[PDB]
Amino acid sequence: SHVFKSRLQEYAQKYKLPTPVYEIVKEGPSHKSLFQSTVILDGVRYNSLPGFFNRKAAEQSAAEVALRELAK
């Protein structure tokens, strides 16, 4: 998904917070791995959906979750 990581970075910078950092979790068969990510921003942890096929897709999902929650 194209744009969630960059939108979250812009948010971080606007609000004087460190660049979001991503934890990447990998599981399953070595060549059918599944990925989940947690983004950490201003101390707060936001979790992606499970079951992505690569780290970037997971990270984007985590950033999406973060953005949605920051708006509530």
Swiss-Prot record:
Compartments in which it is found: Nucleus; Nucleus speckle
Signal sequence extent: none
Domain DRBM: 3-72
Coiled coil (UniProt feature): none
Inducing or repressing factors: By abscisic acid (ABA).
Tissue expression notes: Expressed in rosette and cauline leaves, stems, roots, flowers and siliques.
Summary of the knockout phenotype: Short plant, delayed flowering, leaf hyponasty, reduced fertility, decreased rate of root growth, altered root gravitropic response, decreased sensitivity to auxin and cytokinin and hypersensitivity to abscisic acid (ABA). Reduction of several miRNA accumulation.
Disulfide bonds: none
Superkingdom, natural source: Eukaryota
Miscellaneous field: Plants overexpressing HYL1 show decreased stability of transcripts targeted by miRNAs.
Domain notes: The dsRNA binding domains (dsRBDs) 1 and 2 are sufficient for the function in miRNA precursors processing and mature miRNA generation.
Protein role: Double-stranded RNA-binding protein involved in RNA-mediated post-transcriptional gene silencing (PTGS). Functions in the microRNAs (miRNAs) biogenesis by assisting DICER-LIKE 1 (DCL1) in the accurate processing from primary miRNAs (pri-miRNAs) to miRNAs in the nucleus. Forms a complex with SERRATE (SE) and DCL1 to promote accurate processing of pri-miRNAs by DCL1. Binds and assist DCL1 for accurate processing of precursor miRNAs (pre-miRNA).
Complex formation: Homodimer. Heterodimer with DRB2, DRB4 or DRB5. Interacts with SE and DCL1. Interacts with RCF3, RS40 and RS41.
Protein name stated in the entry: Double-stranded RNA-binding protein 1
Organism: Arabidopsis thaliana
